[PDB]
């Protein structure tokens, strides 16, 4: 529809739609957010300058990311920028240290930005609280790990890679 950009990705949607509601979640450091939840199963383009991914994700649920990208990193910010932009509970679950999230004077920033810029600090805890599975074998494509080494057998999931 009207494209918007999100960790430095034009995103786009492509099909679906969705309605929202606030719900105050609960971070794994025990901070609650209160975030504004897209209900229903959209698909989405992102566009960054080093990386393309194509999304489809449903109700705080992310179920497939295709990505491609120039490198490790490029490819790693994607996949950050989507698991946060999918709103899942893992995500959630996957906050650590300092209760960076409460409010400081008048601020009243931005939920979901707040999480993405955790997440860019360090997304170890992130891929691994994610979970993996086993992979159908399609050529052209690849899994990744969370320790981003590719792998043809397992994936994080919902997660592929298309070689460059």
Not at 31 to 46: A, C, D, N, S
Request: glycine share 8%; with cysteine.
């Amino acid at each position: 529809s009207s494209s918007f950009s999100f960790g430095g990705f034009t995103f786009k949607r492509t099909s679906g739609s969705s309605v929202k509601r606030e719900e105050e979640v609960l971070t794994g450091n025990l901070q609650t957010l209160k975030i504004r939840v897209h209900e229903g199963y959209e698909e989405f383009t992102m566009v960054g300058r080093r990386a393309t991914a194509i999304l489809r994700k449903a109700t705080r649920r992310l179920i497939q990311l295709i990505v491609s990208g120039r490198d490790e990193q490029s490819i790693a910010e994607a996949i950050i920028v989507a698991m946060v932009f999918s709103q899942e509970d893992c995500m959630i679950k996957a906050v650590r240290g300092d209760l960076n999230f409460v409010n400081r004077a008048n601020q009243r920033l931005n939920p979901m930005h707040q999480l993405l810029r955790h997440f860019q600090k360090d997304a170890k805890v992130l891929f691994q609280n994610w979970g993996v599975e086993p992979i159908d074998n399609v050529m052209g494509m690849i899994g990744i790990l969370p320790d981003m080494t590719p792998s043809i057998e397992m994936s994080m999931r919902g997660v592929r890679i298309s070689k460059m």
